[PDB]
Swiss-Prot record:
The gene is PPP1R10. This is Serine/threonine-protein phosphatase 1 regulatory subunit 10. It comes from Homo sapiens (Human). Residues 78-152 form the TFIIS N-terminal domain. It comes from the Eukaryota. Component of the PNUTS-PP1 complex (also named PTW/PP1 complex), composed of PPP1R10/PNUTS, TOX4, WDR82, and PPP1CA (or PPP1CB or PPP1CC). Substrate-recognition component of the PNUTS-PP1 protein phosphatase complex, a protein phosphatase 1 (PP1) complex that promotes RNA polymerase II transcription pause-release, allowing transcription elongation. Promoter-proximal pausing by RNA polymerase II is a transcription halt following transcription initiation but prior to elongation, which acts as a checkpoint to control that transcripts are favorably configured for transcriptional elongation. Expressed in heart, brain, placenta, lung, liver, skeletal muscle, kidney and pancreas. The lineage of its organism: Eukaryota, Metazoa, Chordata, Craniata, Vertebrata. It is found in: Nucleus; Chromosome. The TFIIS N-terminal domain specifically recognizes disordered sequences in protein substrates that are then dephosphorylated by PPP1CA (or PPP1CB or PPP1CC). Disulfide bonds: none annotated.
Length: 154
């Protein structure tokens, strides 16, 4: 879509999150494909932990696959991968686990796993996450991804 600067005074991060409702359906999931483009651009700047957790949920409740592929296209996958290793340093159980659920929720391919080492990062979590649910979730994601990586290699 077209873009322009449209500079203005600062906007509340509450108001930025509130502005995402405009992209949802009555049923609660993102219905506009370009809406996710803006959701992702704001996710880059989601400095607050609660804000990140909220963004993860918005993607998770978005069962619609057309939205999820576009989230990956804009590089949302790359951002989830960044959030994963970033949250590992703070050992934030709910953030970490919810990030992993978002990875499993979107359609994945071996290329994304190898290029950003994501599979190697979650491997550490499968053994080092203190919370039993988190290490369980991470272990499922590892085993699932190993099936994909072993299906196409060289």
């Amino acid at each position: 879509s077209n873009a322009a600067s449209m500079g203005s005074g600062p906007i509340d991060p509450k108001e930025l999150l509130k502005g995402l409702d405009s992209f949802l359906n009555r049923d609660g999931e993102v219905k506009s494909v370009d809406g996710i483009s803006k959701i992702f651009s704001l996710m880059k700047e989601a400095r607050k932990m609660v804000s990140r957790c909220t963004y993860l949920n918005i993607l998770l409740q978005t069962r619609s696959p057309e939205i999820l592929v576009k989230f990956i296209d804009v590089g949302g996958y790359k951002l989830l991968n960044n959030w994963l290793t970033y949250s590992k340093t703070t050992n934030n159980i709910p953030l970490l686990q919810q990030i992993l659920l978002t990875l499993q929720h979107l359609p994945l391919t071996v290329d994304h796993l190898k290029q950003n080492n994501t599979a190697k990062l979650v491997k550490q979590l499968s053994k080092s996450s203190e919370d039993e649910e988190l290490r369980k979730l991470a272990s499922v994601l590892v085993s699932d991804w190993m099936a994909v990586i072993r299906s196409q290699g060289s």
